Design a protein. Structure first.
Ligand code: DMJ
Ligand code: CA
Ligand code: CA
Ligand code: NA
Length: 438
């Protein structure tokens, strides 16, 4: 007869904040200044350069701490950065990961606080990454660069690793007045878009020196994914008319040639970029970001249909498998990366009309994370989703500190610290617009 008791969303937001503060205390105790905590053993690891940590998880956490009103914790992290974080290091850093995690994490912390030193450090790092773009006659970045010397390595790259810079670099250009950052990021994206096939698709794999594709596989998934996000995000952040056009053209080519149904559910397998023949049967969990991008570009019904494929994986397996075979619906791997893309899609679709269904689905995902990944000193990736209980690995990935706890808190809290109508998030969930003073 009566309804089951309605969710108290403010109480659930307070629980997310409590858990985030508890995890931060574990990082301070076991991994202070180090890149990642291993929260089962209570130890740390490096991410970018073995033996030369750069405070990765501390930097990733900063904007999340501020949004939650964890102000003492935020200021302790900012003060560590200002005293300790140098990028004058004789070692190789992966250009893509360094931009989205460290340049973006310093920019969101700068926008929250106003502190000039955080902008100075973001810009210093971007100038070291610029050497990877300058080493290509096409302006396509090499995958790795030595932060001190500018030496490059590995030009056999991909759309995500040449095309996930324009949000962070374009905000640098706005704040500093120097257009060079925006221009270098946009030039790399134009290169691959100019090489689209007659059916409107790009292959995912590209060589920085020849400028030619090195496979025939078009993908929406890993090695391509965030290129398509950053086309739309550059329209939203900068008003760039080329990027607005390109975002819509690329998505409608993918809907025409990659959207396929298997057992009644929508998937986007890999296809030959010229002929449209299917070339893969795998889909990763990370492809769930695309449900939210579909809604952003004006394809909400199709975005909700794709989200439903992942909702069915969550209801069936509890945790979404890291990879599935689309022809059967069954897992290709048993381990996970404590991945954030399902609540990413839920937040992006919820920002359109505030439909409470997206809150219900994200609450299932948060509660499942608490039931499976909680460890002695924080939250961990999984070894095997098929055992009962699910067995645990021993690592908290840096992106956990920027992404899913922020997504849950934004969905549940209605915080006055954010202007929800102006909110813009990077592919690492760094807030690049929408802070309100308080
Ligand atoms: O899976 C989370 C991981 N995926 C690649 C990036 O887009 C970002 O979401 C994060 O580093
Ligand atoms: Ca992402
Ligand atoms: Ca996005
Ligand atoms: Na962050």
């Amino acid at each position: 007869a009566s309804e089951t008791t309605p969710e108290d969303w403010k109480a659930l937001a307070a629980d997310v904040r409590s858990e985030f503060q508890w995890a931060w205390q574990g990082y301070v105790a076991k991994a202070w200044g180090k890149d990642e905590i291993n929260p089962v053993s209570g130890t740390s690891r490096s991410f970018f350069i073995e033996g030369h940590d750069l405070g990765l998880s501390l930097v990733e956490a900063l904007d999340t701490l501020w949004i939650m009103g964890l102000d003492a914790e935020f200021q302790a992290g900012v003060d560590w950065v200002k005293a300790n974080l140098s990028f004058d290091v004789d070692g190789n850093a992966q250009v893509f990961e360094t931009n989205i995690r460290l340049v973006g994490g310093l920019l969101s912390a700068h926008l929250a606080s106003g502190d000039p030193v955080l902008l100075a450090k973001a810009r210093d790092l971007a100038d070291r990454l610029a050497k990877a773009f300058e080493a290509s006659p096409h302006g396509l970045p090499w995958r790795y660069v030595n932060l001190r010397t500018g030496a490059v390595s590995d030009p056999e790259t991909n759309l995500a690793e040449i095309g996930t810079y324009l949000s962070e670099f374009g905000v640098l250009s706005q704040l500093t007045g120097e257009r060079k950052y925006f221009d270098m990021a946009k030039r790399a994206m134009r290169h691959t878009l100019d090489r689209r096939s007659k059916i409107g698709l790009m292959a995912a794999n590209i060589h920085a020196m020849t400028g030619a594709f090195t496979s025939r596989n078009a993908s929406i998934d890993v090695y391509a994914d965030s290129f398509y996000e950053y086309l739309w995000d550059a329209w939203a952040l900068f008003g760039d008319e080329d990027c607005k056009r390109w975002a819509v053209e690329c998505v409608d080519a993918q809907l025409a040639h990659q959207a396929k149904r298997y057992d009644g559910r929508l998937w986007f397998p890999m296809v030959d970029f010229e002929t449209g023949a299917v070339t893969g049967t795998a889909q990763s969990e990370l492809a769930a970001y695309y449900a939210g991008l579909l809604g952003q570009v004006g394809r909400k019904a199709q975005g909700d249909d794709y989200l439903a494929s992942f909702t069915y994986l969550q209801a069936t397996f509890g945790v979404i498998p890291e990879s599935i075979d689309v022809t059967t619906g069954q897992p290709r791997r048993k381990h996970t990366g404590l991945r954030p893309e399902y609540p990413d899609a839920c937040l992006n679709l919820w920002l359109i009309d505030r439909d409470p269904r997206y809150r219900r689905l994200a609450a299932i995902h948060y509660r499942e994370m608490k039931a499976t990944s909680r460890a002695a000193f924080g939250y961990t990736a999984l070894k095997d989703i098929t055992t009962r209980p699910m067995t645990q690995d021993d690592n908290c990935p840096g992106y956990w500190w920027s992404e899913q706890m922020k997504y849950y808190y934004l969905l549940f809290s209605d915080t006055p610290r954010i202007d929800y109508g102006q909110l813009q998030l990077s592919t690492e969930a760094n807030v690049l617009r929408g802070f309100r003073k308080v």
